[PDB]
């Protein structure tokens, strides 16, 4: 029994919610709040533990960018602090390779990071690796065939259609084919042999378009668009289908969750979050307790 966990997010202020959705029965489960509210974080799972990485606490009494790594154990329904990153990273992207967590990009105040660092759970240590060729915040990140991809974002001046790939054994980043669309704050994930980029902000509008990169052919192709335009959406894959959660459509903070079936190239509404929000962290692991 595997669940889609959504951590944090933003509506009026940064949120502390941890809620888990069960696609087998449509149920939502409210779980232990984050110790610190945060939006613009990323979520990921290593060894059945859920991790919340980076973000920012937008609060009535201040805005604090987060370098925090916090671990959630579903067996205990408890959050524990882990080692903090070298720098705060708001609107971060993360990916997991070989049990290690890679933190990519993000902002610290007006600083837009190209820097990248790697967490080793068995030592509770972060270490910096080679930086990206481009500064990227609102960057989408995914892992395919043990290579790490950084897609889109904002470099401080322009929103980006560019993307690049990290080769761990060479500690080296290389540009890949750019997307067909400029996207900041897109949902980026992997399904089969393709990197998907859904939604985001192109500098003028929130997008509903979706495109995917075939690593073998090195081309981006559009698929069916989402039913809702959305930036700052959460995304994950669960049993061969993409789920997108919430985001901002220029008018509302969405509670809509949509599901993409790649066999039929269609999106359907599958549930609503308990409240509209953007900038969530999302990951999949076992059900709690
Ligand atoms: C920058 N960008 C990726 C946006 O989508 C965006 C653009 C203009 C205004 C806003 C946003 C945005 C994104 C998420 C939460 C709130 C906002 C806003 O007020």
Is any ligand 1 atom within 6 A of the Cβ of residue 39? no
User: Using CA positions, which residue lies closest to atom 7 of ligand 1?
Assistant: 201
Residue 23 tokens read as 């696609």
- For residue 157, what are the contacts with CB-CB under 8 A and spacing of at least 6? none
DSSP three-state, residue 158:
coil
Ligand 1 and 185: CB distance under 6 A: yes
Which value in Å is the resolution of this experimental model?
2.0
Q: Is 151 in the pocket of ligand 1 (CB under 6 A)?
A: no
For ligand 1, atom 1, the nearest C-alpha belongs to 201
**What's the token pair of residue 15?**
């949120």
Answer yes or no: is the C-beta of 115 below 6 A from any ligand 1 atom. no
**Spatial contact of 91 and 139, defined as CB atoms under 8 Å apart:** yes
| Pairing mode of beta strands 2-7, 281-286 | antiparallel
Question: In angstroms, rounded to a whole number, what is the distance separating the alpha carbons of residues 265 and 271?
Answer: 19
Q: After which residues is the chain broken (C to N over 2.5 A)?
A: none
Closest ligand 1 atom number to CA of residue 247: 14
What would the DSSP string read from start to end of 82-97? EPPPSS--BS-EEEEE
Type and span of the H or E element at 214 = strand 210-214
Method of determination is X-ray
For residue 138 and ligand 1, the question of a CB distance below 6 A is answered with yes
Helix (H, G, I), strand (E, B) or coil at 226: coil
**Residue 68, Cα to own-chain centre: how many angstroms?**
15
| 62: Cβ contacts below 8 Å, ≥ 6 apart | none
Using the mean position of ligand 1's atoms as its centre, give its distance from the Cα of residue 248 in Å: 7
Residue with the nearest Cα to atom 4 of ligand 1?
Answer: 201
Question: How far is residue 271's CA from residue 277's CA, in Å, rounded to a whole number?
Answer: 14
Maximum C-alpha span of the chain:
50
What six digits make up the tokens of 256? 């809509």
Place of tokens 């696609």: 23
CB of residue 58 inside a 6 A radius of ligand 1: no
CA of 247 to the centre of ligand 1 (A): 9
Enter the tokens of residue 28. Answer: 């939502």
Sorted by sequence, the CB contacts under 8 Å of residue 193 that are 6+ apart come out as: 144, 214, 215, 216
Kindly state if the Cβ of 256 falls inside 6 Å of ligand 1: no
Q: Is the CB of 248 under 6 A from ligand 1?
A: yes
Question: Which contiguous run of DSSP H or E holds residue 257?
Answer: strand 256-261
């Amino acid at each position: 029994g595997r669940l889609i966990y959504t951590a944090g997010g933003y509506f009026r202020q940064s949120l502390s919610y941890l809620e888990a959705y069960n696609p087998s029965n449509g149920s939502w489960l409210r779980l232990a709040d984050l110790q610190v509210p945060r939006s613009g974080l990323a979520g990921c799972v290593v060894g059945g533990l859920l991790y919340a990485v980076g973000g920012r606490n937008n609060s009535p009494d201040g805005n604090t960018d987060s370098s925090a790594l916090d671990c959630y154990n579903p067996m205990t329904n408890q959050w524990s602090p882990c080692a903090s990153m070298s720098v705060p990273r708001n609107r971060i992207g993360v990916g997991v390779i070989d049990g290690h967590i890679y933190a990519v990009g993000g902002s610290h105040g007006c600083i837009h990071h190209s820097s990248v660092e790697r967490y080793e759970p068995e030592r509770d240590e972060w270490h910096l690796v080679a930086p990206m060729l481009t500064r990227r915040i609102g960057v989408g990140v995914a892992v395919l065939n043990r290579l790490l991809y950084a897609v889109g974002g904002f470099d401080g001046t322009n929103r980006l259609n560019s993307a690049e790939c990290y080769y761990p054994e060479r500690n080296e980043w290389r540009m890949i084919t750019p997307m067909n669309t400029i996207r900041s704050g897109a949902g980026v994930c992997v399904l089969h042999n393709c990197i998907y980029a859904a939604g985001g902000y192109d500098g003028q509008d929130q997008l509903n378009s979706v495109e995917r990169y075939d690593v073998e052919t090195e081309t981006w192709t559009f698929v069916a668009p989402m039913r809702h335009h959305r930036s700052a959406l959460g995304i994950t894959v669960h049993q061969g289908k993409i789920y997108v959660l919430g985001g901002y459509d220029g008018h509302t903070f969405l509670d809509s969750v949509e599901c993409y079936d790649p066999d039929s190239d269609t999106w359907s509404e599958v549930t609503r979050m308990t409240s509209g929000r953007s900038g969530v962290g999302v990951a999949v692991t076992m059900e709690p307790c």
